[PDB]
């Protein structure tokens, strides 16, 4: 499972802002990005179905599930999953409270980016978190760091959790959350 996790999380993600919705139906979205590329994004979760209609603008913070294809028309087509949110941006980028424990002991962060989007898909948060964990805390880089979890507690107390030993559960993904409403984010590596 490690190679798969290391592969998925140490690599980057695609970020596109103000992409236009071409189509939204039957669990997938066809989106036109400002760089001219076309994104075909699937939404497998019955709990997360973007309601954006044709012509609406959206932001993408997503991962490719297949190799992008350069068409004969000179257009890149990306095959991504989830990560479609509105375009609202916070007045100024904010620091999300991420507390990390590795084998029981607190572990200070390094290179934890600020966030400027009002809403982010839970899967986006998941990859941002684990990416941080793999780059600075060695998650998936050594046999003593292949599991654990991350947990986001909202201000109203609701929580979101993800097992670090498994790939994110896109199939049950909940709707995007307002990050300015996140109380804490904690992650333990075991």
Q: Which domains does the chain have, with CATH numbers?
A: 1-13+85-190 (3.10.20.120), 14-84 (2.40.50.110)
Contact 35, 20 (CB under 8 A): no
83: left (phi over 0), alpha (psi -120 to 50) or beta: left
What is the spatial distance between Cα 66 and Cα 160, in angstroms, rounded to a whole number? Answer: 27
CA 134/CA 138 separation, integer angstroms: 5
**What gap in Å lies between CA 119 and CA 178, rounded to an integer?**
4
In sequence order, the 6+-apart residues with CB closer than 8 A to the CB of 74 are: none
Token duo for residue 28: 């997938």
User: Under a CB-based contact definition with an 8 Å cutoff, are residues 15 and 64 in contact?
Assistant: no
Inter-residue contact 122 to 85 (CB < 8 Å) = no
Determination method here? Answer: X-ray
């Amino acid at each position: 499972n490690i190679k798969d996790l290391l592969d998925w999380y140490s690599s980057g993600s695609d970020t596109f802002t103000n992409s236009e919705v071409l189509d939204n139906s039957l669990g997938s979205m066809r989106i036109k990005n400002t760089d001219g590329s076309i994104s075909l994004i699937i939404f497998p979760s019955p709990y997360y179905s973007p309601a954006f209609t044709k012509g609406e603008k959206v932001d993408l913070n997503t991962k490719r599930i297949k190799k992008s294809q350069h068409t004969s028309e000179g257009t890149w087509i990306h095959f991504q999953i989830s990560g479609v949110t509105n375009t609202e941006k916070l007045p100024t980028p904010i620091e999300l409270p991420l507390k990390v424990k590795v084998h029981g002991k607190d572990s200070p962060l390094k290179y934890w980016p600020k966030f400027d989007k009002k809403q982010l898909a839970i899967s986006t948060l998941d990859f941002k978190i684990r990416h941080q964990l793999t780059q600075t805390h060695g998650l998936y880089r050594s046999s003593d760091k292949t599991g654990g979890y991350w947990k986001i507690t909202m201000n109203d107390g609701s929580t979101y959790q993800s097992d670090l030993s498994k790939k994110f559960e896109y199939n049950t993904e909940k709707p995007p959350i307002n990050i300015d409403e996140i109380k804490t984010i904690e992650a333990e590596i075991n």
